[PDB]
Design a binder for this molecule. Structure first.
Ligand SMILES: CCCCCCCCCCCCCCCCCC(=O)OC[C@H](COP(=O)([O-])OCC(O)COP(=O)([O-])OC[C@@H](COC(=O)CCCCCCCCCCCCCCCCC)OC(=O)CCCCCCCCCCCCCCCCC)OC(=O)CCCCCCCCCCCCCCCCC
Ligand code: BCL
Ligand code: BCL
Ligand code: BCL
Ligand SMILES: CC[C@H]1c2cc3[nH]c4c(c3C)C(=O)[C@H](C(=O)OC)c4c3nc(cc4[nH]c(cc(n2)[C@@H]1C)c(C(C)=O)c4C)[C@@H](C)[C@@H]3CCC(=O)OC/C=C(\C)CCC[C@H](C)CCC[C@H](C)CCCC(C)C
Ligand SMILES: CC[C@H]1c2cc3[nH]c4c(c3C)C(=O)[C@H](C(=O)OC)c4c3nc(cc4[nH]c(cc(n2)[C@@H]1C)c(C(C)=O)c4C)[C@@H](C)[C@@H]3CCC(=O)OC/C=C(\C)CCC[C@H](C)CCC[C@H](C)CCCC(C)C
Ligand SMILES: COC1=C(OC)C(=O)C(C/C=C(\C)CC/C=C(\C)CC/C=C(\C)CC/C=C(\C)CC/C=C(\C)CC/C=C(\C)CC/C=C(\C)CC/C=C(\C)CC/C=C(\C)CCC=C(C)C)=C(C)C1=O
Ligand SMILES: COC1=C(OC)C(=O)C(C/C=C(\C)CC/C=C(\C)CC/C=C(\C)CC/C=C(\C)CC/C=C(\C)CC/C=C(\C)CC/C=C(\C)CC/C=C(\C)CC/C=C(\C)CCC=C(C)C)=C(C)C1=O
Ligand SMILES: CCCCCCCCCCCCCCCC(=O)OC[C@H](COP(=O)(O)OCC[N+](C)(C)C)OC(=O)CCCC[C@H](Br)[C@@H](Br)CCCCCCCCCCC
Ligand SMILES: CCCCCCCCCCCC[N+](C)(C)[O-]
Ligand SMILES: CCCCCCCCCCCC[N+](C)(C)[O-]
Lengths: 244, 281, 302
């Protein structure tokens, strides 16, 4: 230092970068904190960063607001139990982890409404109800039989559910043997020339994919259950996954 | 302690080695077999560095430096005091980084996510390995790798560059620079865009990704979209490192003269080589 | 092989999206351009529409004149011969006035005047484009983060081309318009200032430039890794956290012991990037105005 301008500037920069990191870390604590013990009570050691002052997001289309930080709560039962007498070990599913939605089958209790676009219309629609939408490039999946990782057919593709504002494919709607349908995340299927293959699930697990309560829209809560369930099969359908 | 939403995801399984033997956390950190491997390699690494400090006669971290074996050693081993420590520390480094990548894979499996992170990370490891392993192997000596020291490695960068004139003239290096600057451009833009939608003018409602496409279309006539932009950032930054690896793997090996002179191939193409005027005639 | 979601498998198309209106003057938007199935494998297929008010027309025009002015000089350097123009393209240079002319505008066209003209046009192109980034945000009710972020890049450029030359007392300190010639300028700048590696601001700039690649690799990889739960729909994940946002936090928490939020990762992002050119521009500004030699300075200040 310090009767030199470059020295004053670099010293000042470090002070600023320390404040910036502090600010950035506290901004990143608007969700998930305070830290909890494994029983859900507040942990003793919160760290040296305090919770920031809340901010409020005004949500569009009369959906209200979100104020964070606020009271954290799962708003759903978690079918898991301890496997050790001390902290830091896994928690074993107490039933079927795919049905109970724990582990990599986990879902969050998002709003039970669909995501809306800029004009207040449902963001995701079956292509059949999406005026003017059509497949523009690539193999069209509609009509292909759907194969699970047990190398067995679980059903047939009956539509693509599309993101209207982003003009992209988000799910395949798949008809099962009983005539009902399910949604499969597009990120979890492989469209092949003569089939759609689903590595994550064996055929017998398709029935258990969480259903949507109205056939022409999907809610944020429903997306989370479907995507959770399908992801969970990488781990939990592993015994039925023939080598490939 | 756990995040408010964490418990449901801390289930058994996903490990690559050891079954349940290491399927546990220490505070926030997942361990696993590769957690134990990472600790072992890092720890042995840091202790060897600390010991190299002793042999150097300093404990200052702006001064501590571990140099590789001198070029006379070729690709054999060197005494600990004189390059040996560097060689074992490089093995520990490699073991730590790869162990860290594989631990990341175990974490992905437990969480049911894609493997894109450890895959991205593997480009950094490869860049490191180019400089300390592939390039030295291909040039015939460990002496060509960089020393491990905060400033001494910067000297290596400068001395290595000026060995080939102004290193700017490395064409793979120009591409790499371009991806780095473009990646930083995409990062500013992406952060600013999402925050501008999440944080609108005072009193107004959060904007929508439709607002994010509109902003960019109004502005430059194109929007890559929200899946697009994350694909882009991943491509830009991985491409930056790939070309970095490339620009060095070729320097000292296929090209070793002054980089400016490489551009003569274009200038001397026969259809214009002899046409007078210009800078080169 | 698991689908990795780097390229799309099926593209869908619908009616051209003409975008949100909010307060935007619609008279100034074009119609949509063509759709590119090629782009569509990676991002959106739709090209256009673009907004072109008077500030846009000014900025493009000015930007084109800047490109006209350098181009005319190049063609002249090439003796008007397209063979030579292509041959020597990277060697041509539009160079600023000599030291003798200081900060005056009195230099001949072939020897400074054209460089000033070009720099004039560029200055108008950039600043009005800056204003455009603010004004387009405003019309859609959005925050001004983009214009603030763009301002950090403008900073480094302003320092290199305008502020530092002015403080040094001559235009000859500014950067020439040329591919090779500007690389040479950069090298020479470091040599003559005692090696920029000893400039702490230059080091910081590198930390942020590398860190930007680190960060966007982390982030883009993370979002793609959780795209099977709708991860890229970040605004709604901000408004209503989903299992995408929770798995992404927890990947990082379990790996390195701390994590971000869906909004907050964008604050780390905007800052990591912007600090590239903030610190970078400080480093350059101080060079030759206050520190002639960074090695020397380094020996007396740490
Ligand atoms: C060498 C020494 C260097 C020292 C400092 C170097 C860098 C300084 C830059 C500071 C900028 C801070 C701006 C700000 O307040 O952001 C608002 C932001 C709120 O953002 P938001 O909630 O999304 O906005 C809501 C609305 O939409 C409202 O937002 P909006 O849409 O109207 O605008 C977005 C907002 C937020 O936008 C951003 O945060 C993006 C950041 C990009 C900013 C780049 C700055 C450009 C500078 C270019 C010129 C460089 C010259 C070099 C200097 O940006 C602004 O606040 C307006 C900035 C106006 C430009 C200022 C021109 C100055 C010349 O809160 C912060 O960013 C706080 C930053 C925390 C830094 C703390 C530093 C610690 C200080 C020391 C104490 C610690 C002791 C340790 C011991
Ligand atoms: C006088 C010097 C020469 C020159 C000589 C060289 C030389 C020599 C090299 C470069 C390299 C590069 N140069 Mg050059 N270069 C010059 C001018 C420039 C300019 C400029 C504006 O002028 C720029 C922007 C660049 C840009 C670059 C990049 C393209 C590339 C560096 C990134 C990289 O390799 O990442 C790759 C990333 C890594 C290697 C990081 C690896 C990280 C590992 C895996 C993780 C470590 C974990 C750590 C130990 C953990 C710590 C503990 C925790 C933090 C708790 N050069 C001048 C002309 N340049 C380098 C390159 O391409 O290398 C391959 C290189 O070797
Ligand atoms: C990539 C091309 C060249 C090179 C060229 C340059 C140039 C040029 C510069 C640096 C700079 C840095 N480099 Mg180097 N560097 C190289 C390879 C490496 C490797 C490696 C294991 O391969 C490491 C760990 C580093 C580490 C570093 C940091 C000391 C410093 C800031 C970087 C940064 O923020 O990056 C981005 C990463 C982050 C923001 C994440 C945090 C990373 C932290 C800071 C790493 C701490 C490293 C620690 C001190 C090393 C010891 C590990 C311990 C024993 C556990 N470099 C290769 C040889 N590097 C700058 C500097 O200021 O040097 C003095 C600088 O100007
Ligand atoms: C031999 C060369 C010297 C050296 C000399 C210099 C000089 C001189 C400078 C740098 C600077 C930088 N160097 Mg160095 N550098 C060296 C060695 C290195 C090494 C290395 C591995 O060895 C690395 C990684 C770097 C890296 C860096 C960067 C961190 C930094 C530039 C950031 C940036 O985004 O700029 C790019 C961003 C811009 C230039 C902003 C531009 C914004 C404007 C508004 C865009 C206008 C566009 C116009 C309209 C045309 C667009 C047309 C479109 C198609 C529409 N240097 C050696 C020591 N370096 C810069 C800096 O900040 O230093 C402190 C700088 O000035
Ligand atoms: C490929 C694109 C870019 C990228 C991506 C990237 N890096 C990553 C990842 C990804 C995707 C991770 O997932 C991983 C991570 O956890 O990040 C938080 C990581 C990572 N990138 C890191 C650093 C880093 N990345 C860099 C670069 C890049 N990373 C690219 C630009 C750089 C530089 C210099 O540019 C650095 C310094 C770490 C924060 C983290 C990896 C952490 C890790 O491997 O931990 C295990 C090892 C240890 C805890 C210590 C090892 C100790 C050694 C045995 C001794 C030290 C030897 C070393 C060679 C000495 C170096 C001295 C220096 C002065 C030269
Ligand atoms: C913060 C650090 C980084 C950063 C950030 C950043 N840059 C930015 C921004 C931000 C936040 C913007 O908002 C702004 C932007 O618009 O991005 C899309 C910008 C920008 N960064 C740019 C470039 C850029 N940034 C760089 C660097 C960086 N930018 C840093 C790494 C670099 C380098 C050198 O690394 C470059 C080259 C521009 C793309 C854009 C600013 C545009 C601008 O100022 O334009 C003025 C010039 C013109 C308008 C000329 C237009 C010429 C066209 C090609 C003509 C097209 C018309 C057609 C050919 C003819 C039609 C008529 C016919 C009859 C002739
Ligand atoms: C919320 O979400 C978001 C969106 O969605 C809603 C968005 O739309 C967007 C908006 C995004 C866009 C509109 C896309 C932006 C595009 C870019 C940032 C750049 C894309 C550019 C590339 C993919 C390529 C750039 C090219 C590079 C880096 C290479 C160039 C190389 C050189 C110049 C090399 C030098 C020359 C030579 C000759 C050397 C070699 C010679 C021989 C080998 C011979 C954002 C930000 C976003 O956040
Ligand atoms: C959208 O979603 C996303 C998130 O969340 C919602 C995220 O959080 C993140 C993550 C990003 C951030 C939190 C932003 C901040 C990060 C940076 C600026 C990048 C650089 C990071 C660092 C420099 C920190 C590095 C720390 C490391 C590598 C850990 C150090 C580790 C230890 C000291 C413990 C070692 C653990 C071991 C050895 C394993 C076994 C342990 C034993 C005890 C045995 C991203 C990308 C994201 O996209
Ligand atoms: C970031 C800026 C980069 C440099 C700045 C310039 C970038 C934009 C360049 C602008 C070029 C536009 C060309 C002229 C515009 C034009 O006339 O388009 C016409 C046509 C037809 O419509 P009309 O003429 O019929 O509309 C007339 C109005 N009405 C119908 C109301 C009467 O419309 C179009 O084709 C618009 C399509 C423009 C697409 C532009 Br060129 C996109 Br593809 C450029 C993409 C470049 C990406 C930007 C680089 C950004 C880099 C960092 C991250 C962004
Ligand atoms: C580039 C440097 C980034 C390092 C940021 C350091 C943040 C450490 C955060 C630790 C806090 C974790 N905790 C206890 C709040 O959960
Ligand atoms: C691949 C990177 C380093 C490989 C090093 C190969 C040689 C082993 C180092 C041991 C040197 C010490 N000693 C006494 C055994 O020679």
């Amino acid at each position: 230092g310090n009767f030199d301008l470059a020295s004053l500037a670099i010293y000042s920069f470090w002070i600023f970068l320390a404040g910036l990191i502090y600010y950035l870390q506290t901004e990143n604590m608007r969700e998930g904190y305070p830290l909890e013990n494994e029983d859900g009570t507040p942990a003793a050691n919160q760290g040296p960063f305090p919770l920031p002052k809340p901010k409020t997001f005004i949500l569009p289309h009369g959906r209200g607001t979100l104020t964070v930080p606020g009271p954290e709560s799962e708003d759903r039962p978690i079918a898991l139990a301890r496997t050790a007498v001390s902290e830091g070990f896994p928690h074993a599913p107490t039933g079927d982890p795919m049905k109970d939605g724990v582990g990599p089958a986990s879902w969050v209790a998002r709003r039970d409404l669909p995501e809306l676009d800029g004009h207040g219309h449902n963001k995701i629609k079956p292509m059949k109800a999406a005026a003017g939408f059509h497949v523009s490039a690539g193999k069209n999946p509609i009509g292909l039989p759907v194969r699970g990782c047990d190398l067995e057919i679980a059903g047939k593709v009956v539509d693509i559910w599309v993101d209207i504002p982003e003009q992209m494919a988000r799910f395949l709607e798949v008809e099962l043997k009983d005539g009902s349908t399910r949604l499969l995340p597009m990120q979890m299927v492989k469209v092949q020339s003569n089939r759609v293959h689903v590595n994550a699930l064996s055929s017998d697990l398709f029935a258990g994919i969480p259903t949507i309560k109205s056939p022409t829209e999907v809610t944020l809560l429903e997306e989370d259950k479907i995507c959770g369930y399908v992801a969970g099969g990488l781990m939990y359908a592993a015994p039925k996954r023939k080598s490939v | 302690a756990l995040l408010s939403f964490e418990r449901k995801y801390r289930v058994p399984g996903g490990t690559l080695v050891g079954g349940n033997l290491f399927d546990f956390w220490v505070g926030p950190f997942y361990v696993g077999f590769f957690g134990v491997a990472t600790f072992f390699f890092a720890a042995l690494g840091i202790i060897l560095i600390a010991w190299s400090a002793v042999l150097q006669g300093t404990w200052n971290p702006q001064l501590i430096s571990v140099y590789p074996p001198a070029l006379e050693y070729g690709l054999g081993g060197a005494p600990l005091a004189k390059g040996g420590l560097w060689q074992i520390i490089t093995i520990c480094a490699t073991g730590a980084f790869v162990s860290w990548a594989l631990r990341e894979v175990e974490i992905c499996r437990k969480l049911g996510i894609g493997y894109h992170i450890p895959f991205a990370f593997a480009f950094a490891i490869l860049a490191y390995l180019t400089l300390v392993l592939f390039r030295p192997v291909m040039m015939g000596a460990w002496g060509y790798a960089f020393p491990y020291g905060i400033w001494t490695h910067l000297d290596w960068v400068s001395n290595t560059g000026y060995t080939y004139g102004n290193f700017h003239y490395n064409p793979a290096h120009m591409i790499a620079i371009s991806f780095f600057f473009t990646n930083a451009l995409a990062l500013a833009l992406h952060g600013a865009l999402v925050l501008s939608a999440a944080n609108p003018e005072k009193g107004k409602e959060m904007r929508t990704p439709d607002h994010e496409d509109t902003f960019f279309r109004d502005l430059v006539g194109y929007s890559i979209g929200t899946l697009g932009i994350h694909r882009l950032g991943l491509l830009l930054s991985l491409s930056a490192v790939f070309f970095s690896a490339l620009c060095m793997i070729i320097t000292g090996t296929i090209w070793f003269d002054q980089w400016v002179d490489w551009w003569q191939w274009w200038v001397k193409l026969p259809w214009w080589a002899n046409i007078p005027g210009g800078i080169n005639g | 092989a698991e689908y990795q979601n780097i390229f799309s498998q099926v593209q869908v198309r619908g009616p051209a999206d003409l975008g949100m209106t909010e307060d935007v003057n619609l008279a100034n938007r074009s119609g949509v351009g063509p759709f590119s199935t090629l782009l569509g494998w990676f991002g959106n297929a739709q090209l256009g529409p673009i907004y072109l008010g008077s500030l846009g027309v000014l900025s493009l025009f000015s930007g084109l004149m800047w490109f006209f002015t350098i181009g005319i000089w190049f063609w002249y350097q090439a003796g008007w011969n397209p063979a030579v123009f292509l041959r020597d393209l990277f060697f041509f240079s539009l160079e600023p006035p000599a030291p003798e002319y200081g900060l005056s505008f009195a230099a001949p066209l072939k020897e400074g005047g054209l460089w000033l003209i070009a720099s004039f046009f560029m200055f108008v192109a950039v600043w009005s484009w800056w204003g455009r980034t603010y004004l387009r945000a405003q019309a859609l009710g959005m925050g001004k983060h983009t214009a603030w972020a763009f301002l950090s890049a403008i900073w480094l450029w302003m320092v290199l081309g305008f502020i530092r030359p002015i403080l040094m007392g001559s235009w000859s300190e500014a950067v020439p318009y040329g591919i090779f010639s500007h690389l040479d300028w950069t090298n020479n700048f470091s040599l003559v200032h005692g090696n920029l590696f000893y400039n702490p601001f230059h080091g910081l700039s590198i930390a942020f430039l590398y860190g930007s690649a680190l960060l966007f690799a982390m982030h883009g990889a993370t979002i793609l890794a959780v795209s099977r739960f709708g991860g890229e729909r970040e605004l709604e994940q901000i408004a209503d956290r989903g299992t995408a946002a929770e798995r992404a936090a927890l990947f990082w928490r379990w790996t390195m012991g701390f994590n971000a939020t869906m909004e907050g990762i964008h604050r780390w992002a905007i800052w990591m990037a912007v600090l590239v050119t903030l610190t970078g521009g400080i480093g350059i500004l101080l060079s030759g105005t206050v520190v002639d030699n960074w090695y020397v300075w380094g020996q007396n200040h740490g």
